[PDB]
Write a protein that holds these residues in place. Sequence first.
Motif, PDB file in Angstrom:
ATOM      1  N   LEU A   1       0.858  -1.212   0.000  1.00 33.22           N
ATOM      2  CA  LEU A   1       0.000   0.000   0.000  1.00 33.22           C
ATOM      3  C   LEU A   1       0.885   1.250   0.000  1.00 33.22           C
ATOM      4  O   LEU A   1       2.083   1.132   0.277  1.00 33.22           O
ATOM      5  N   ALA A   2       0.294   2.412  -0.293  1.00 30.03           N
ATOM      6  CA  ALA A   2       1.059   3.660  -0.498  1.00 30.03           C
ATOM      7  C   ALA A   2       1.831   3.976   0.778  1.00 30.03           C
ATOM      8  O   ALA A   2       2.972   4.422   0.652  1.00 30.03           O
ATOM      9  N   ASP A   3       1.244   3.706   1.945  1.00 32.48           N
ATOM     10  CA  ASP A   3       1.884   3.999   3.256  1.00 32.48           C
ATOM     11  C   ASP A   3       2.836   2.877   3.688  1.00 32.48           C
ATOM     12  O   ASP A   3       3.320   2.931   4.839  1.00 32.48           O
TER      13      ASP A   3
ATOM     14  N   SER B   1      -3.130   7.145  -7.345  1.00 31.53           N
ATOM     15  CA  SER B   1      -4.222   7.685  -6.488  1.00 31.53           C
ATOM     16  C   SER B   1      -4.167   7.105  -5.072  1.00 31.53           C
ATOM     17  O   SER B   1      -4.963   7.546  -4.239  1.00 31.53           O
ATOM     18  N   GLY B   2      -3.348   6.064  -4.824  1.00 31.47           N
ATOM     19  CA  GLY B   2      -3.410   5.309  -3.561  1.00 31.47           C
ATOM     20  C   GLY B   2      -4.475   4.219  -3.584  1.00 31.47           C
ATOM     21  O   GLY B   2      -4.548   3.461  -2.621  1.00 31.47           O
ATOM     22  N   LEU B   3      -5.274   4.136  -4.645  1.00 33.68           N
ATOM     23  CA  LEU B   3      -6.256   3.040  -4.825  1.00 33.68           C
ATOM     24  C   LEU B   3      -5.508   1.791  -5.317  1.00 33.68           C
ATOM     25  O   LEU B   3      -4.359   1.929  -5.748  1.00 33.68           O
ATOM     26  N   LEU B   4      -6.174   0.645  -5.306  1.00 32.96           N
ATOM     27  CA  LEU B   4      -5.603  -0.638  -5.788  1.00 32.96           C
ATOM     28  C   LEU B   4      -6.312  -1.028  -7.087  1.00 32.96           C
ATOM     29  O   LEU B   4      -7.562  -1.055  -7.118  1.00 32.96           O
TER      30      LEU B   4
ATOM     31  N   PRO C   1      -8.934   1.110  -0.301  1.00 36.28           N
ATOM     32  CA  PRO C   1      -8.649   0.532   1.018  1.00 36.28           C
ATOM     33  C   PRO C   1      -9.249   1.362   2.165  1.00 36.28           C
ATOM     34  O   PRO C   1      -9.437   0.810   3.246  1.00 36.28           O
ATOM     35  N   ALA C   2      -9.601   2.626   1.917  1.00 35.82           N
ATOM     36  CA  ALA C   2     -10.165   3.520   2.964  1.00 35.82           C
ATOM     37  C   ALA C   2     -11.644   3.187   3.203  1.00 35.82           C
ATOM     38  O   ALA C   2     -12.071   3.201   4.368  1.00 35.82           O
ATOM     39  N   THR C   3     -12.397   2.813   2.166  1.00 34.01           N
ATOM     40  CA  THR C   3     -13.874   2.643   2.264  1.00 34.01           C
ATOM     41  C   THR C   3     -14.315   1.205   2.006  1.00 34.01           C
ATOM     42  O   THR C   3     -15.481   0.909   2.286  1.00 34.01           O
TER      43      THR C   3
ATOM     44  N   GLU D   1      -7.788   3.213 -16.313  1.00 32.05           N
ATOM     45  CA  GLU D   1      -7.818   4.598 -16.857  1.00 32.05           C
ATOM     46  C   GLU D   1      -8.772   5.463 -16.018  1.00 32.05           C
ATOM     47  O   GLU D   1      -9.916   5.054 -15.785  1.00 32.05           O
ATOM     48  N   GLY D   2      -8.276   6.586 -15.496  1.00 32.32           N
ATOM     49  CA  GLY D   2      -9.061   7.515 -14.664  1.00 32.32           C
ATOM     50  C   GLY D   2      -8.865   7.290 -13.172  1.00 32.32           C
ATOM     51  O   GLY D   2      -9.423   8.092 -12.406  1.00 32.32           O
ATOM     52  N   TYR D   3      -8.143   6.241 -12.745  1.00 34.03           N
ATOM     53  CA  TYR D   3      -7.963   5.919 -11.302  1.00 34.03           C
ATOM     54  C   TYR D   3      -6.483   6.046 -10.917  1.00 34.03           C
ATOM     55  O   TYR D   3      -6.135   5.784  -9.758  1.00 34.03           O
ATOM     56  N   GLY D   4      -5.635   6.481 -11.838  1.00 38.99           N
ATOM     57  CA  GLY D   4      -4.188   6.621 -11.632  1.00 38.99           C
ATOM     58  C   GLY D   4      -3.388   5.621 -12.440  1.00 38.99           C
ATOM     59  O   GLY D   4      -3.960   4.583 -12.850  1.00 38.99           O
TER      60      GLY D   4
END
Lengths: 294, 317
Positions: A129-131, A190-193, A218-220, A283-286
């Motif tokens: 993950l990004a963190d 974006s930090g999304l997967l 991963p946040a929601t 495409e559109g999510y990073g």
Amino acid sequence: KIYGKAILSFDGVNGYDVYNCSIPFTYDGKTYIFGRVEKKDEWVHSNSILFEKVGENRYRRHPASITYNLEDPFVVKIHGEMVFGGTHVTKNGGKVSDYRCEFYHGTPFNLKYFSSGPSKMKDIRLVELADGKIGIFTHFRTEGSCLTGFTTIDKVEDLTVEVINSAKLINHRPFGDAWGGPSQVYLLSSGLLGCISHHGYLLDQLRIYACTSFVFDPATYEVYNFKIIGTKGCFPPCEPKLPHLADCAFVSGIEMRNDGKCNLYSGIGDVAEGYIVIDYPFEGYGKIVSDVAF
Amino acid sequence: SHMGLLNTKPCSLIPAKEAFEREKKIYGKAILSFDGVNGYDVYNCSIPFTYDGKTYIFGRVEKKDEWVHSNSILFEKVGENRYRRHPASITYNLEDPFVVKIHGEMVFGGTHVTKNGGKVSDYRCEFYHGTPFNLKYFSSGPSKMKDIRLVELADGKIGIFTHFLTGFTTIDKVEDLTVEVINSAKLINHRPFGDAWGGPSQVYLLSSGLLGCISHHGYLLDQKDGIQLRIYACTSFVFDPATYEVYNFKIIGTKGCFPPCEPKLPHLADCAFVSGIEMRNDGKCNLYSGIGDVAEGYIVIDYPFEGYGKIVSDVAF
Ligand SMILES: OC[C@H]1O[C@@H](O)[C@@H](O)[C@@H](O)[C@@H]1O
Ligand SMILES: OC[C@H]1O[C@H](O)[C@@H](O)[C@@H](O)[C@@H]1O
Ligand SMILES: OC[C@H]1O[C@H](O)[C@@H](O)[C@@H](O)[C@@H]1O
Ligand SMILES: OC[C@H]1O[C@H](O)[C@@H](O)[C@@H](O)[C@@H]1O
């Protein structure tokens, strides 16, 4: 829109079938892939073998590497090293009695076994993950259900049956009545997967295994942009292992190209590994920020 | 107790082990050399076997400073006391590989270890069958049972030794090897083994119809000044599959009989984990053993089943 397609050739495995590969990865200035190796007329007699890319669409068994008594090999980079996994099958007098994901870590030619997932759970995938935490996708399908979980750990050694079994359920609604889960997970900018996934449908009955993708937050615990991105019919023709697998593609994952398109690698018909050249599915999510450059 | 408070229940095997070390006849010894495994240690091998006009052995391959990180690799004999990894063979994610011939084919096994977050959580024997370069996985034994060995009996049935206490049962066909069959094995006459743990490594059919067992027997030795030793001695006995009776139980090898080699950890300074025997032209035997969990050697010994018949089973594949 398909911009190209190929079936891979695999040398050094006595003409056995090679399918359901890892994605390709790099190490020491070469390209490699793990393949599930099995005789065409044998069932549940697989080993996972490290192959070196030697030419366009051509790989050869690397003789230095050990082999793994596993099906459906997969790779990911966590904290600067390889995590390798596959399915370890247990039989009881010739009949399958259990199967579990086994996990190795280290360098590609020096992998060390450190954990197994729960009994009868195949679809476990990791990502950094990004963190810097480790994301874990789980698949609950031992009780008739087919649900995806997600949890995190700090260190790969913390991957336990207890952590996997406790994973919080994701919003599985978009998947419809499909069984399966991710083959390969990517961290996006974006930090999304970005998940490249395998989903099977029984269509009232036709057995379909399709290459799918979705984006996960991963946040929601929300799932976005679930779609089909490949089917067996997209790849070059090849006779399936048996006629009931004539519409079975078991995805491996994507490899970005310089042109912003990607190679979608898939097992096809349980007999071969191919790729189709497709548009970037996230495409559109990073952009993908994870890599498998070891 | 002769150990007094050091151990108030000394293993009955201790006098046998000391007596063997006073009275043994050793005609030769060697440590095997293994090429093609990057300096890794090779130990707890199968017995040697032949295939396609060559000699092979399976070895347990592990870095000296790594624990529970083994793979089993097929090695081809290069020269005297010397083997190399055969690059065509797959490798097996197993410890303590062992082989036997059943109904004209190889049955290959080893221990498959399961971990949970780096910690050992389970282990079971996995069994493969076929030809040496074409082995197919077909069954596992019960959770936490390491000491399962097969043999083809005089009547063509398959004998199975189990370790709960040593058990014995039979099946008709190797595909009948199930957890349920293994768990239902009847106990053998444990009187001579006593409170020593372990079981067969290699089982042989003798011309008498009895079974020659080359076995591993162990105990813990608390030392006044030193740490606790995990003792393993090479043992043998003859078994009657009709009555479950044991004959001619003895010690046939100990670590100190083999050439010197520093053990993996100090507690294994007297650990010889037997592999089995190979008959020689001269009527003596090569007793192969893992030693110190670091190496494989053999000692040249008298035939341990002398007076109970000649070995009529083979590993000529
Ligand atoms: O460690 C000493 C011996 O202990 C035994 O139980 C087995 O685990 C062997 O593989 C090993 O050689
Ligand atoms: O994992 C055991 C077995 O399960 C399913 O039937 C399929 O995925 C097979 O490919 C596999 O051999
Ligand atoms: O379909 C062709 C494909 O089938 C199997 O997977 C292997 O033998 C490959 O080397 C080969 O290219
Ligand atoms: O030196 C003893 C022994 O140690 C290990 O088992 C290996 O390196 C062998 O090749 C060697 O012969």
